[PDB]
Amino acid sequence: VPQELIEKIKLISPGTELRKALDDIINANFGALIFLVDDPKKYEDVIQGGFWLDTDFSAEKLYELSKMNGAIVLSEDITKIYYANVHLVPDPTIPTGETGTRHRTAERLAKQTGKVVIAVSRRRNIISLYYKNYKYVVNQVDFLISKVTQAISTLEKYKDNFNKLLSELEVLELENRVTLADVVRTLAKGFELLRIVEEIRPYIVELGEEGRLARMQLRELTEDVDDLLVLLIMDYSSEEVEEETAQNILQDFITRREPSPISISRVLGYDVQQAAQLDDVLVSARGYRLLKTVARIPLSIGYNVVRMFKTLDQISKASVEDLKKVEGIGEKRARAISESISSLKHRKT
Amino acid sequence: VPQELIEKIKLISPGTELRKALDDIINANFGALIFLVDDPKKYEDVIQGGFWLDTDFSAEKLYELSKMNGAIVLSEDITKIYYANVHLVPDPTIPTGETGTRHRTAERLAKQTGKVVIAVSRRRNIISLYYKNYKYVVNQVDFLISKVTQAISTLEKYKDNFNKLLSELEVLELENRVTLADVVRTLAKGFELLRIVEEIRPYIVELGEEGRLARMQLRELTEDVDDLLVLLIMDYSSEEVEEETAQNILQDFITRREPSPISISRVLGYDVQQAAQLDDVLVSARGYRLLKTVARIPLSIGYNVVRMFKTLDQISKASVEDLKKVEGIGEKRARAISESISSLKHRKT
Amino acid sequence: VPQELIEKIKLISPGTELRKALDDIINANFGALIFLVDDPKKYEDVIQGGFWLDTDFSAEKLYELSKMNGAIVLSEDITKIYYANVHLVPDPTIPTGETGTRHRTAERLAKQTGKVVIAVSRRRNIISLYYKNYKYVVNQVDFLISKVTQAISTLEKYKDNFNKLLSELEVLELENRVTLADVVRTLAKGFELLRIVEEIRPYIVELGEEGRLARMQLRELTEDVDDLLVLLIMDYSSEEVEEETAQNILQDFITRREPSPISISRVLGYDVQQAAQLDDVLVSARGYRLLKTVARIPLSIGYNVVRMFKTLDQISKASVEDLKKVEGIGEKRARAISESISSLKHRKT
Amino acid sequence: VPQELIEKIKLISPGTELRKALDDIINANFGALIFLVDDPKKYEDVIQGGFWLDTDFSAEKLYELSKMNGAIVLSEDITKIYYANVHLVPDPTIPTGETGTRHRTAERLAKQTGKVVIAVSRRRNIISLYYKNYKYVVNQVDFLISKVTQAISTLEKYKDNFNKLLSELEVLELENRVTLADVVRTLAKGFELLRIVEEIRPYIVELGEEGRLARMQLRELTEDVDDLLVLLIMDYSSEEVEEETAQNILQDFITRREPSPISISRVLGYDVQQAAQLDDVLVSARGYRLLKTVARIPLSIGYNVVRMFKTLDQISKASVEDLKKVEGIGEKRARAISESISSLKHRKT
């Protein structure tokens, strides 16, 4: 979905005076056919009849005008009403797959001029936006709230399962009993969860000002999940991996690749092709997750800690003095590392 | 609900171009009477008047045609519009319990020809589908989302109670203090939960493409519940039971039998007839649940482990070497069994 | 709300053929005026004109008839349609506070005859039922689902807070550090929760068949809460209290009395009048809750256990042999008591 | 939003007979123009024509009258209907930004007289209230329930994250390993949560009687959160702070200031300007939170306890006799302090 078109969709998103007018028009079963231009003179050959207005835009004015037959011409910045009650005459030879004169005119006119045209028919409650060779149908808020509320409820269930997987993983991590199956299962659930977020994003955007609570909910449910998955990938990949690399593996499984167990464990660098194999592959966390998240050790410095001790298990055996040899670890960070791991072992295992 | 009819319901489920047309028609309070055939010539005696069209189907075309009186005839694959504005004349002597000419014609015509007929009346918002001697009323999405959203909320409450029962059961299992009441109570709640899933399934299907988020939610809430109940049955039945057997006992209590406490404990092989007796019956888990789920030991091999040690309590006493005598247990699986049980005992009991 | 009237409300609750007819009638903005009798002859002086039908009831027939002016007369069991299009002429001198002829007739006629009369006006979507001197307005399902869904969401929040209070209470109970404030706070939240249930009950009933999922949700959220509160009262009242007594104290605080902290602790037998005092009053559980709920000891027998040891703290000190002296405690129940308390102390404190 | 105007909004809030009338009027697409006065004679120059009624108010009467053209005049206490079908003639020179005669009259008339005027137009479903130079649009309940239900769902997600932050904080507090980042992160989430409450409050008020369940939900979700945040501020501010002071810092971050991490930690008295610094600042709780909340020690007395021991860590080392030296601590409060801390250390760390 081009960014060019997304800028146009903003024009009619909940919160704008234009959208407010269009909601009133839909509510009254008036139709609408609206043409957005910056220089009316340049387009005087596709504009016939009607009334020259040249007056400041308002929602109420647009509403009143739409009671009349034909079309309305506004400035692109939606600050002026230029014409009302006009006949729009785009080139009839331009292909269109729309139905009815109103929507066939709209799509032809947008194709012909490279401008936005908005059509509302009298009996439906959708707003059809046309820009160049684009068509975007904009939905009512109540339809969008419904899908988004469902998506959020779905995200809650994925997130709860993710937390359960993770808390079990933690236990296994601290006891050094993790298998590849355990990692992959946890990553998959994380990947799927953020996929759902990506898929609902267009709905969220369409909601405009009415999507504010929805965005807050997404943010709260997904807050640290991306960082968490990146750290897991750095901790459990077959060979050592830089952060931005792990970030890309996340990007890949969120958007382009399917998060099947074999696919994940393969891209983590393991050579398995049967799902049952994962249970037999023993893995040991590098320790990045615990270092950044719990001991609050910056990644740049955690590299050196992993450089020296290789795995979490060995880090958990190091004394404060042992840790202090690392490039970046003073007594502050050394006790942070030492005490936070041991605290965790005590309470969790 | 025959699979034959379910295939027909798909034709008008959310997501299809046909359903899209019918939603528009309902929205406009046009009526509709639609007859699905593959060879119009064969049915020319029940088709009178109207217009021969023989043109490609589209939703917009169907919508336009439905503005006219009478009926429309489409191909069974919904790829052609054959006739519009026709008079349908099924045998008047065919019994029908429908009301009004439109729906009496629809049901007679479907009975007579063995084909699908769809009726929409002008003032109601339901789609009535008729196939042979079948009638299926298809609901609007908003009605279906409402029931399904409620069903899901109900499932959440059952699932939370199930998790509480289970976590208590776990504690009892690990301390070897389980009574039959504890098992039965946990199975019952599990059985009821999956019953609710079975009952809402027809709603989910009716939702078609609009049921996608709903299916994801069901999947997340019920993910491992069936396996879990099967393992419980294998662990607590009076005498040893094969997996597929336990699977059938699950099937029975989900569909045909009522999950009353006495009924469950009876079919598990216990001879009680008063609910108060269950508290006095001491049981000891075989260990299948812990072996498959936590130690990741495949069922086929767990059989041998249960063969040798009989109960979880005895398995928890076995040393690695002890376990290693089993057909299938190498040092890997032996430490898996040993360490995962002891880890659990430590953290939970 | 008299049970007499509740039986009448059932006649028009979701799920009945009559309610189905009335929904169609409301949906079509026909009005309705319906008179329920068992012997039409006896009431021939209030019935004028119209058509004598004397035919079997169906929803579709009622719907069709309601297209005509005037009133319809059905049998009380809603199995016969007796009259349509009649003029109802109750005594004009009978007081009524209704508006419009339709509803003034309905209430006068019900008062005069002691029968049910149903009025639906054309522009509103409510069903007004009149029985004797009673009027009950029946709501649409969508209005009721909305309030009930909210009530349930509210119950979830009360229940979560109740579980938190209880789990803290447990800890305090097991360490013998409970204060009156802790008990009262927990009872209050429990009392309020079940009040909400009582208040939403009329909505649930009005929903009829459409209230099925709602009832399941209530049941899951409140399952053991009443028993739990009764046991708390038996454990913490100033002097010993029989079960049915504690049951009544529950009944009182659910229905007639306000669950303020002073009020609760006063009726539990404590002489405080300032809320700040509760923090200074030390209490020790009798042990009924733990005995019935965790050790599965029947109340009748728990009495003897409390008879002998007085408090949970002392019960937790008793050896198996010690416990075995009680009337009803064999080695089975003695280890149940002993082991379940100690297990709990280990895991929780 | 002036309290003066809020009193007027109450007049038309769900639950009032007036609001009930207006809902019926909106439902029937009648319009309404209603003028609230206490002495009709004083305003006889803006009231022309119509019918002098001088009769008791009821919703049904208002509904009936509104079927006529023009305006209705009620007493300010909404106990009398004075006029119906009148022509309202406010000074035409009074500025107004409203559209259509009905709403331009309403706003001019309210400005001119200092009284309330209510306008309902025929095609929209909003109630416009005008008081002096104020305009307040009152929404339908279904619109308000939607936003409020969303707000509550959002609050649930904030509250869960708050509980997670807090439980981690607790662990850190008890082990004396807290950093400023940990405090600030927890305060921020708390501040944001209560902001959401403040923002939804106007919606809650607009709901009137229909906001009852919504208020209960807010109360349950936010019950002790303010006290909790105040105690955190007293425990972690750079230098000692009185309760009412901490209360104001809460007030500030809820209403006027943005709860950014640097902003919070700055006003707590720490001199940081880079967010990454917070991880390196070690802090030790004074102990107010644990003293008031868990040991049930009144703040007034906790002051003396903090006076003597300075920090929670030192309080946790004190023996009963040690504690008893404090002004206000007898053996009761001394064991309360001692035992509740040690209990917590055992179970949590």
Side-chain angles (χ1 to χ4, degrees):
Chain A
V1 191
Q3 181 60 16
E4 208 181 10
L5 174 59
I6 293 175
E7 296 307 330
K8 299 307 182 184
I9 284 157
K10 288 169 173 184
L11 299 181
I12 51 171
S13 313
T16 72
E17 282 315 294
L18 177 58
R19 178 57 187 266
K20 183 178 179 180
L22 287 164
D23 288 332
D24 279 309
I25 290 166
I26 287 153
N27 206 89
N29 304 319
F30 310 152
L33 184 57
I34 308 174
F35 181 27
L36 274 39
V37 310
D38 266 341
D39 180 4
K41 300 183 163 185
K42 191 188 182 69
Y43 302 87
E44 73 168 344
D45 56 289
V46 295
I47 299 173
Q48 296 174 349
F51 306 100
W52 173 251
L53 297 179
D54 195 12
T55 186
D56 290 340
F57 175 85
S58 80
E60 289 309 321
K61 289 187 195 185
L62 183 65
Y63 174 79
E64 212 57 46
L65 294 177
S66 85
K67 293 171 172 181
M68 293 192 290
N69 254 16
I72 300 174
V73 181
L74 319 177
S75 57
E76 291 178 38
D77 57 19
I78 312 181
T79 62
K80 304 285 296 185
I81 300 165
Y82 283 133
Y83 289 94
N85 188 226
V86 301
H87 185 196
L88 296 178
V89 290
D91 178 352
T93 63
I94 296 163
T96 181
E98 306 294 316
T99 287
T101 53
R102 187 191 305 277
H103 289 261
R104 289 167 72 81
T105 298
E107 182 176 76
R108 292 190 156 134
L109 187 53
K111 280 192 187 187
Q112 179 173 342
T113 63
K115 304 306 205 182
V116 174
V117 195
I118 313 305
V120 181
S121 74
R122 294 199 175 183
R123 283 183 191 171
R124 298 161 168 70
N125 66 332
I126 47 168
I127 304 177
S128 287
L129 182 145
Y130 302 86
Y131 181 26
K132 286 172 188 177
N133 312 114
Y134 309 109
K135 163 176 198 197
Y136 191 102
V137 171
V138 168
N139 298 97
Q140 286 296 100
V141 161
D142 64 324
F143 168 83
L144 291 167
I145 285 301
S146 181
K147 312 286 301 192
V148 168
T149 304
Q150 287 184 73
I152 287 171
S153 281
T154 307
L155 275 167
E156 281 170 61
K157 316 274 204 292
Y158 272 84
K159 186 60 183 313
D160 297 329
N161 277 336
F162 186 69
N163 284 340
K164 163 178 109 72
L165 285 168
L166 208 42
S167 89
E168 295 160 17
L169 186 48
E170 201 192 19
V171 165
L172 296 182
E173 192 157 296
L174 294 165
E175 302 183 356
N176 197 23
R177 296 168 35 231
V178 182
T179 78
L180 189 46
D182 295 313
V183 187
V184 166
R185 188 176 304 110
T186 306
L187 289 173
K189 183 109 323 189
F191 290 154
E192 293 177 357
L193 181 165
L194 286 179
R195 258 175 187 258
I196 293 168
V197 170
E198 291 301 320
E199 284 177 30
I200 201 63
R201 188 171 292 145
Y203 294 82
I204 297 294
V205 176
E206 264 192 63
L207 275 170
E209 276 296 333
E210 293 300 310
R212 180 178 173 262
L213 292 173
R215 291 172 180 267
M216 289 163 50
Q217 282 175 277
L218 294 170
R219 188 171 68 78
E220 290 308 294
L221 281 171
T222 62
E223 213 175 12
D224 293 325
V225 166
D226 53 349
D227 298 319
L228 216 160
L229 289 168
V230 176
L231 297 167
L232 281 168
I233 297 169
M234 299 178 55
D235 269 356
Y236 284 112
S237 50
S238 191
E239 96 167 56
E240 58 170 60
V241 155
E242 192 185 328
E243 178 196 354
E244 301 300 327
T245 305
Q247 284 183 223
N248 284 322
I249 294 198
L250 170 56
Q251 266 312 306
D252 211 5
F253 272 111
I254 281 189
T255 53
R256 293 182 183 174
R257 281 175 70 236
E258 265 302 305
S260 75
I262 299 295
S263 199
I264 296 175
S265 59
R266 283 216 142 253
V267 131
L268 286 172
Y270 301 95
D271 193 9
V272 150
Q273 68 282 345
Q274 213 68 43
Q277 283 166 293
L278 304 174
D279 285 318
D280 295 323
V281 172
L282 302 185
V283 296
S284 271
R286 234 90 68 175
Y288 289 114
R289 222 220 314 159
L290 201 138
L291 280 170
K292 181 182 171 199
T293 293
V294 184
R296 302 309 306 185
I297 295 299
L299 230 45
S300 65
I301 304 298
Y303 289 135
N304 308 347
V305 185
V306 167
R307 194 78 277 152
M308 180 158 303
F309 301 90
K310 276 67 189 181
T311 72
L312 175 58
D313 177 60
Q314 292 305 319
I315 301 173
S316 66
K317 290 163 188 177
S319 71
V320 174
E321 288 313 302
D322 298 5
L323 295 162
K324 199 182 167 193
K325 291 302 188 180
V326 176
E327 257 186 11
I329 277 67
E331 202 126 56
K332 148 77 206 282
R333 288 183 164 172
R335 299 210 327 178
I337 291 175
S338 162
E339 296 171 351
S340 68
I341 297 186
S342 66
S343 172
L344 262 168
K345 284 205 168 204
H346 186 94
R347 304 176 279 120
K348 301 302 191 186
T349 71
Chain B
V1 191
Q3 181 60 16
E4 208 181 10
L5 174 59
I6 293 175
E7 296 307 330
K8 299 307 182 184
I9 284 157
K10 288 169 173 184
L11 299 181
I12 51 171
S13 313
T16 72
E17 282 315 294
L18 177 58
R19 178 57 187 266
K20 183 178 179 180
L22 287 164
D23 288 332
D24 279 309
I25 290 166
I26 287 153
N27 206 89
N29 304 319
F30 310 152
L33 184 57
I34 308 174
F35 181 27
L36 274 39
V37 310
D38 266 341
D39 180 4
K41 300 183 163 185
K42 191 188 182 69
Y43 302 87
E44 73 168 344
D45 56 289
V46 295
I47 299 173
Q48 296 174 349
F51 306 100
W52 173 251
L53 297 179
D54 195 12
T55 186
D56 290 340
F57 175 85
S58 80
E60 289 309 321
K61 289 187 195 185
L62 183 65
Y63 174 79
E64 212 57 46
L65 294 177
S66 85
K67 293 171 172 181
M68 293 192 290
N69 254 16
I72 300 174
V73 181
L74 319 177
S75 57
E76 291 178 38
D77 57 19
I78 312 181
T79 62
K80 304 285 296 185
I81 300 165
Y82 283 133
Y83 289 94
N85 188 226
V86 301
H87 185 196
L88 296 178
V89 290
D91 178 352
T93 63
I94 296 163
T96 181
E98 306 294 316
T99 287
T101 53
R102 187 191 305 277
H103 289 261
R104 289 167 72 81
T105 298
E107 182 176 76
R108 292 190 156 134
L109 187 53
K111 280 192 187 187
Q112 179 173 342
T113 63
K115 304 306 205 182
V116 174
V117 195
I118 313 305
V120 181
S121 74
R122 294 199 175 183
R123 283 183 191 171
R124 298 161 168 70
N125 66 332
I126 47 168
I127 304 177
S128 287
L129 182 145
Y130 302 86
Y131 181 26
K132 286 172 188 177
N133 312 114
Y134 309 109
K135 163 176 198 197
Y136 191 102
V137 171
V138 168
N139 298 97
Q140 286 296 100
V141 161
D142 64 324
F143 168 83
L144 291 167
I145 285 301
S146 181
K147 312 286 301 192
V148 168
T149 304
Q150 287 184 73
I152 287 171
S153 281
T154 307
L155 275 167
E156 281 170 61
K157 316 274 204 292
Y158 272 84
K159 186 60 183 313
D160 297 329
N161 277 336
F162 186 69
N163 284 340
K164 163 178 109 72
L165 285 168
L166 208 42
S167 89
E168 295 160 17
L169 186 48
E170 201 192 19
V171 165
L172 296 182
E173 192 157 296
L174 294 165
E175 302 183 356
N176 197 23
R177 296 168 35 231
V178 182
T179 78
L180 189 46
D182 295 313
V183 187
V184 166
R185 188 176 304 110
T186 306
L187 289 173
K189 183 109 323 189
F191 290 154
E192 293 177 357
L193 181 165
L194 286 179
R195 258 175 187 258
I196 293 168
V197 170
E198 291 301 320
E199 284 177 30
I200 201 63
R201 188 171 292 145
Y203 294 82
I204 297 294
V205 176
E206 264 192 63
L207 275 170
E209 276 296 333
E210 293 300 310
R212 180 178 173 262
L213 292 173
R215 291 172 180 267
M216 289 163 50
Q217 282 175 277
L218 294 170
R219 188 171 68 78
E220 290 308 294
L221 281 171
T222 62
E223 213 175 12
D224 293 325
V225 166
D226 53 349
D227 298 319
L228 216 160
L229 289 168
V230 176
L231 297 167
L232 281 168
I233 297 169
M234 299 178 55
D235 269 356
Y236 284 112
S237 50
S238 191
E239 96 167 56
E240 58 170 60
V241 155
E242 192 185 328
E243 178 196 354
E244 301 300 327
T245 305
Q247 284 183 223
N248 284 322
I249 294 198
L250 170 56
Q251 266 312 306
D252 211 5
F253 272 111
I254 281 189
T255 53
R256 293 182 183 174
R257 281 175 70 236
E258 265 302 305
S260 75
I262 299 295
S263 199
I264 296 175
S265 59
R266 283 216 142 253
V267 131
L268 286 172
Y270 301 95
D271 193 9
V272 150
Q273 68 282 345
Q274 213 68 43
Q277 283 166 293
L278 304 174
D279 285 318
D280 295 323
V281 172
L282 302 185
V283 296
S284 271
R286 234 90 68 175
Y288 289 114
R289 222 220 314 159
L290 201 138
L291 280 170
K292 181 182 171 199
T293 293
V294 184
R296 302 309 306 185
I297 295 299
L299 230 45
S300 65
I301 304 298
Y303 289 135
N304 308 347
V305 185
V306 167
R307 194 78 277 152
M308 180 158 303
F309 301 90
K310 276 67 189 181
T311 72
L312 175 58
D313 177 60
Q314 292 305 319
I315 301 173
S316 66
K317 290 163 188 177
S319 71
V320 174
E321 288 313 302
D322 298 5
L323 295 162
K324 199 182 167 193
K325 291 302 188 180
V326 176
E327 257 186 11
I329 277 67
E331 202 126 56
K332 148 77 206 282
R333 288 183 164 172
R335 299 210 327 178
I337 291 175
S338 162
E339 296 171 351
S340 68
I341 297 186
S342 66
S343 172
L344 262 168
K345 284 205 168 204
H346 186 94
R347 304 176 279 120
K348 301 302 191 186
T349 71
Chain C
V1 191
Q3 181 60 16
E4 208 181 10
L5 174 59
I6 293 175
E7 296 307 330
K8 299 307 182 184
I9 284 157
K10 288 169 173 184
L11 299 181
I12 51 171
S13 313
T16 72
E17 282 315 294
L18 177 58
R19 178 57 187 266
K20 183 178 179 180
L22 287 164
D23 288 332
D24 279 309
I25 290 166
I26 287 153
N27 206 89
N29 304 319
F30 310 152
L33 184 57
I34 308 174
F35 181 27
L36 274 39
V37 310
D38 266 341
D39 180 4
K41 300 183 163 185
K42 191 188 182 69
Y43 302 87
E44 73 168 344
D45 56 289
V46 295
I47 299 173
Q48 296 174 349
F51 306 100
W52 173 251
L53 297 179
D54 195 12
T55 186
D56 290 340
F57 175 85
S58 80
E60 289 309 321
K61 289 187 195 185
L62 183 65
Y63 174 79
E64 212 57 46
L65 294 177
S66 85
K67 293 171 172 181
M68 293 192 290
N69 254 16
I72 300 174
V73 181
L74 319 177
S75 57
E76 291 178 38
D77 57 19
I78 312 181
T79 62
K80 304 285 296 185
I81 300 165
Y82 283 133
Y83 289 94
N85 188 226
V86 301
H87 185 196
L88 296 178
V89 290
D91 178 352
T93 63
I94 296 163
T96 181
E98 306 294 316
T99 287
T101 53
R102 187 191 305 277
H103 289 261
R104 289 167 72 81
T105 298
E107 182 176 76
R108 292 190 156 134
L109 187 53
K111 280 192 187 187
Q112 179 173 342
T113 63
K115 304 306 205 182
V116 174
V117 195
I118 313 305
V120 181
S121 74
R122 294 199 175 183
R123 283 183 191 171
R124 298 161 168 70
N125 66 332
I126 47 168
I127 304 177
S128 287
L129 182 145
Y130 302 86
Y131 181 26
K132 286 172 188 177
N133 312 114
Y134 309 109
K135 163 176 198 197
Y136 191 102
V137 171
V138 168
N139 298 97
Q140 286 296 100
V141 161
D142 64 324
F143 168 83
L144 291 167
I145 285 301
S146 181
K147 312 286 301 192
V148 168
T149 304
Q150 287 184 73
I152 287 171
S153 281
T154 307
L155 275 167
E156 281 170 61
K157 316 274 204 292
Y158 272 84
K159 186 60 183 313
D160 297 329
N161 277 336
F162 186 69
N163 284 340
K164 163 178 109 72
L165 285 168
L166 208 42
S167 89
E168 295 160 17
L169 186 48
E170 201 192 19
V171 165
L172 296 182
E173 192 157 296
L174 294 165
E175 302 183 356
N176 197 23
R177 296 168 35 231
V178 182
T179 78
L180 189 46
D182 295 313
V183 187
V184 166
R185 188 176 304 110
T186 306
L187 289 173
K189 183 109 323 189
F191 290 154
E192 293 177 357
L193 181 165
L194 286 179
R195 258 175 187 258
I196 293 168
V197 170
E198 291 301 320
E199 284 177 30
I200 201 63
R201 188 171 292 145
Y203 294 82
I204 297 294
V205 176
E206 264 192 63
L207 275 170
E209 276 296 333
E210 293 300 310
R212 180 178 173 262
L213 292 173
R215 291 172 180 267
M216 289 163 50
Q217 282 175 277
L218 294 170
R219 188 171 68 78
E220 290 308 294
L221 281 171
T222 62
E223 213 175 12
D224 293 325
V225 166
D226 53 349
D227 298 319
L228 216 160
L229 289 168
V230 176
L231 297 167
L232 281 168
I233 297 169
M234 299 178 55
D235 269 356
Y236 284 112
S237 50
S238 191
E239 96 167 56
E240 58 170 60
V241 155
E242 192 185 328
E243 178 196 354
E244 301 300 327
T245 305
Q247 284 183 223
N248 284 322
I249 294 198
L250 170 56
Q251 266 312 306
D252 211 5
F253 272 111
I254 281 189
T255 53
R256 293 182 183 174
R257 281 175 70 236
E258 265 302 305
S260 75
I262 299 295
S263 199
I264 296 175
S265 59
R266 283 216 142 253
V267 131
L268 286 172
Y270 301 95
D271 193 9
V272 150
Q273 68 282 345
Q274 213 68 43
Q277 283 166 293
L278 304 174
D279 285 318
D280 295 323
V281 172
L282 302 185
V283 296
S284 271
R286 234 90 68 175
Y288 289 114
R289 222 220 314 159
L290 201 138
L291 280 170
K292 181 182 171 199
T293 293
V294 184
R296 302 309 306 185
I297 295 299
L299 230 45
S300 65
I301 304 298
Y303 289 135
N304 308 347
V305 185
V306 167
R307 194 78 277 152
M308 180 158 303
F309 301 90
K310 276 67 189 181
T311 72
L312 175 58
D313 177 60
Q314 292 305 319
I315 301 173
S316 66
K317 290 163 188 177
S319 71
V320 174
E321 288 313 302
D322 298 5
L323 295 162
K324 199 182 167 193
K325 291 302 188 180
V326 176
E327 257 186 11
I329 277 67
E331 202 126 56
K332 148 77 206 282
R333 288 183 164 172
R335 299 210 327 178
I337 291 175
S338 162
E339 296 171 351
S340 68
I341 297 186
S342 66
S343 172
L344 262 168
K345 284 205 168 204
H346 186 94
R347 304 176 279 120
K348 301 302 191 186
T349 71
Chain D
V1 191
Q3 181 60 16
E4 208 181 10
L5 174 59
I6 293 175
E7 296 307 330
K8 299 307 182 184
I9 284 157
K10 288 169 173 184
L11 299 181
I12 51 171
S13 313
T16 72
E17 282 315 294
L18 177 58
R19 178 57 187 266
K20 183 178 179 180
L22 287 164
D23 288 332
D24 279 309
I25 290 166
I26 287 153
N27 206 89
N29 304 319
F30 310 152
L33 184 57
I34 308 174
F35 181 27
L36 274 39
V37 310
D38 266 341
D39 180 4
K41 300 183 163 185
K42 191 188 182 69
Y43 302 87
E44 73 168 344
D45 56 289
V46 295
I47 299 173
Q48 296 174 349
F51 306 100
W52 173 251
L53 297 179
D54 195 12
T55 186
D56 290 340
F57 175 85
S58 80
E60 289 309 321
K61 289 187 195 185
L62 183 65
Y63 174 79
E64 212 57 46
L65 294 177
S66 85
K67 293 171 172 181
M68 293 192 290
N69 254 16
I72 300 174
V73 181
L74 319 177
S75 57
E76 291 178 38
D77 57 19
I78 312 181
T79 62
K80 304 285 296 185
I81 300 165
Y82 283 133
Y83 289 94
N85 188 226
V86 301
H87 185 196
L88 296 178
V89 290
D91 178 352
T93 63
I94 296 163
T96 181
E98 306 294 316
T99 287
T101 53
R102 187 191 305 277
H103 289 261
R104 289 167 72 81
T105 298
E107 182 176 76
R108 292 190 156 134
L109 187 53
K111 280 192 187 187
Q112 179 173 342
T113 63
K115 304 306 205 182
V116 174
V117 195
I118 313 305
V120 181
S121 74
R122 294 199 175 183
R123 283 183 191 171
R124 298 161 168 70
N125 66 332
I126 47 168
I127 304 177
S128 287
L129 182 145
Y130 302 86
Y131 181 26
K132 286 172 188 177
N133 312 114
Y134 309 109
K135 163 176 198 197
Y136 191 102
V137 171
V138 168
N139 298 97
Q140 286 296 100
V141 161
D142 64 324
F143 168 83
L144 291 167
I145 285 301
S146 181
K147 312 286 301 192
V148 168
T149 304
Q150 287 184 73
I152 287 171
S153 281
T154 307
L155 275 167
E156 281 170 61
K157 316 274 204 292
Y158 272 84
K159 186 60 183 313
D160 297 329
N161 277 336
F162 186 69
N163 284 340
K164 163 178 109 72
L165 285 168
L166 208 42
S167 89
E168 295 160 17
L169 186 48
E170 201 192 19
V171 165
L172 296 182
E173 192 157 296
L174 294 165
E175 302 183 356
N176 197 23
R177 296 168 35 231
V178 182
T179 78
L180 189 46
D182 295 313
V183 187
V184 166
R185 188 176 304 110
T186 306
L187 289 173
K189 183 109 323 189
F191 290 154
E192 293 177 357
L193 181 165
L194 286 179
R195 258 175 187 258
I196 293 168
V197 170
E198 291 301 320
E199 284 177 30
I200 201 63
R201 188 171 292 145
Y203 294 82
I204 297 294
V205 176
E206 264 192 63
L207 275 170
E209 276 296 333
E210 293 300 310
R212 180 178 173 262
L213 292 173
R215 291 172 180 267
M216 289 163 50
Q217 282 175 277
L218 294 170
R219 188 171 68 78
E220 290 308 294
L221 281 171
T222 62
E223 213 175 12
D224 293 325
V225 166
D226 53 349
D227 298 319
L228 216 160
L229 289 168
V230 176
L231 297 167
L232 281 168
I233 297 169
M234 299 178 55
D235 269 356
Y236 284 112
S237 50
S238 191
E239 96 167 56
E240 58 170 60
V241 155
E242 192 185 328
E243 178 196 354
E244 301 300 327
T245 305
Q247 284 183 223
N248 284 322
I249 294 198
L250 170 56
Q251 266 312 306
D252 211 5
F253 272 111
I254 281 189
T255 53
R256 293 182 183 174
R257 281 175 70 236
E258 265 302 305
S260 75
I262 299 295
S263 199
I264 296 175
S265 59
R266 283 216 142 253
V267 131
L268 286 172
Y270 301 95
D271 193 9
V272 150
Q273 68 282 345
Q274 213 68 43
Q277 283 166 293
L278 304 174
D279 285 318
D280 295 323
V281 172
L282 302 185
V283 296
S284 271
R286 234 90 68 175
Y288 289 114
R289 222 220 314 159
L290 201 138
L291 280 170
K292 181 182 171 199
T293 293
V294 184
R296 302 309 306 185
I297 295 299
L299 230 45
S300 65
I301 304 298
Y303 289 135
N304 308 347
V305 185
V306 167
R307 194 78 277 152
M308 180 158 303
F309 301 90
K310 276 67 189 181
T311 72
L312 175 58
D313 177 60
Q314 292 305 319
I315 301 173
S316 66
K317 290 163 188 177
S319 71
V320 174
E321 288 313 302
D322 298 5
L323 295 162
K324 199 182 167 193
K325 291 302 188 180
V326 176
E327 257 186 11
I329 277 67
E331 202 126 56
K332 148 77 206 282
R333 288 183 164 172
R335 299 210 327 178
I337 291 175
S338 162
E339 296 171 351
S340 68
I341 297 186
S342 66
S343 172
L344 262 168
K345 284 205 168 204
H346 186 94
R347 304 176 279 120
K348 301 302 191 186
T349 71

